[PDB]
């Protein structure tokens, strides 16, 4: 067919972008060639059919509140993003990000995408976050929130070790195709 419109929302500085660009250009987080423009495109193969997937990359700051939902019409699918080591980005998913896209597109499907899952299993951040009275987000606790809010599923990935990265974008297209 034609492009699929996947609009990605989430708190700034959770590596929303760092993982968009690093997947779509076959670079590691270390070697991606930087740029000034936004949005990324990537063919993804799925059962011997090639699908192209536009990635719209939205700012996370309140300042852009008035202007962000301009990108929401004709969206086919949404990626809602928190970093699993960032318990504010996780609560900003219950109380801001998901109430919004479903206000404007109450039928466009969405995914919960936890990110930077390499610092979860990292012994220097957990005892870094805990010395602030917080733990990281286990997938246990994230999985429920997705069912709690009827996301298609939850998916987590590491930009850096590429783990489950491809599964994120594979689900997105499947979600959109239904």
């Amino acid at each position: 067919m034609q492009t699929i419109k996947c609009v990605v929302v989430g708190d700034g500085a959770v590596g929303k972008t760092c993982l968009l660009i690093s997947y779509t250009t076959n670079k590691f987080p270390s070697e991606y060639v930087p740029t000034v423009f936004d949005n990324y495109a990537v063919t993804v193969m799925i059962g011997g059919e090639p699908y192209t997937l536009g990635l719209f990359d939205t700012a996370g700051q309140e300042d852009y509140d008035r202007l962000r939902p301009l990108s929401y019409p004709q969206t086919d699918v949404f990626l809602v993003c928190f970093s699993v080591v960032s318990p504010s980005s996780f609560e900003n998913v219950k109380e801001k990000w998901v109430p919004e896209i479903t206000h404007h597109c109450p039928k466009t499907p969405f995914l919960l995408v936890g990110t930077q899952i390499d610092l979860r299993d990292d012994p220097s951040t957990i005892e870094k976050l805990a010395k602030n009275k917080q733990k990281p987000i286990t997938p246990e606790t994230a999985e429920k929130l997705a069912r709690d809010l009827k996301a298609v599923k939850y998916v987590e990935c590491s930009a850096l070790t590429q783990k489950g990265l491809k599964n994120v974008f594979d689900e997105a297209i499947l979600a959109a195709l239904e």
Partner: protein, 275 residues
């Protein structure tokens, strides 16, 4: 352009590799293979051999020091590469239809600062264009074939800017003049050229580089050529906004209007520098 296939560079480091240690191949993987894929395949195949806590991927691209390497671990460097052609070699892949037939030069890009980081500001960002030459040329009876010569090219921060711009000026070009047009793809490209909310966007480029006519004329060739790539840019966003107006339905009227209030805000700001 994976009409040719997918090409990664693979280097092997460590005694545990026997005859491979310090060899560098180019692997020919079938079209649309993601870095994630093969790296999972390679490390997971050598996690079957040596032991899982022994395989480590060099999540990098610029060259390899060895004394930084745990002489007990098996290190693999995996890096995506593209076929590299002469300006003559390319022209002939345009007219004649058969194109996959002398692939023996492949290129990756690695960025850096003079500061030893990987990225910087716009005025700080250098880029290394590395060219690998191979022992044979694809297609060929095996799927890997190992490197033999190698050439570094260095792009000054302005050349890097120029390269970004040209890539994007043509991203518009192609989406505009394509039939049946893809609205979603074209808006995505356009909304990210004029309506950027995340990255720094084109105006900050021309501010950095186009705000002083340099004295050194070796640098004028670059300064002025950046100016002209902006002139051609500005004309392709107009030509794209004009097209998206032909394409949207009611729901995207304010959307489109903002993309226009953007581009005009920007071309006003550009025109002092581009003249």
């Amino acid at each position: 352009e994976r009409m040719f296939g997918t090409y990664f560079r693979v280097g092997f480091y460590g005694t545990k590799f026997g005859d491979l240690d310090e060899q560098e191949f180019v692997y020919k993987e079938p079209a649309i293979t993601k870095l994630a894929e093969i790296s999972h395949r390679l490390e997971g195949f050598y996690g079957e051999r040596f032991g899982e806590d022994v395989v480590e991927v060099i999540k990098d691209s610029n060259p390899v020091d060895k004394c930084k390497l745990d002489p007990n671990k098996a290190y693999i460097q995996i890096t995506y590469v593209e076929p590299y052609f002469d300006t003559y070699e390319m022209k002939d892949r345009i007219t004649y239809f058969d194109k996959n037939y002398n692939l023996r030069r492949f290129m990756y890009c690695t960025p850096f600062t003079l500061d030893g980081r990987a990225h910087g500001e716009l005025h700080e960002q250098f880029k290394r264009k590395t060219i690998l030459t191979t022992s044979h040329a694809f297609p060929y009876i095996k799927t890997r074939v190992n490197v033999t010569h190698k050439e570094e090219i260095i792009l000054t921060p302005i050349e890097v800017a120029i390269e970004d711009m040209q890539k994007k000026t043509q991203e518009l070009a192609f989406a505009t003049h394509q039939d049946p047009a893809d609205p979603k793809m074209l808006q995505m490209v356009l909304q990210g050229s004029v309506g950027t909310t995340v990255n720094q966007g084109p105006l900050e480029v021309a501010q950095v580089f186009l705000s002083e006519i340099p004295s050194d004329p070796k640098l004028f060739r670059h300064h002025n050529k950046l100016r002209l790539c902006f002139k051609d840019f500005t004309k392709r966003c107009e030509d794209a906004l004009r097209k998206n107006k032909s394409l949207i339905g009611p729901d995207q009227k304010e959307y489109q209007r903002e993309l226009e209030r953007n581009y005009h805000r920007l071309k006003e700001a550009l025109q002092p520098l581009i003249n």
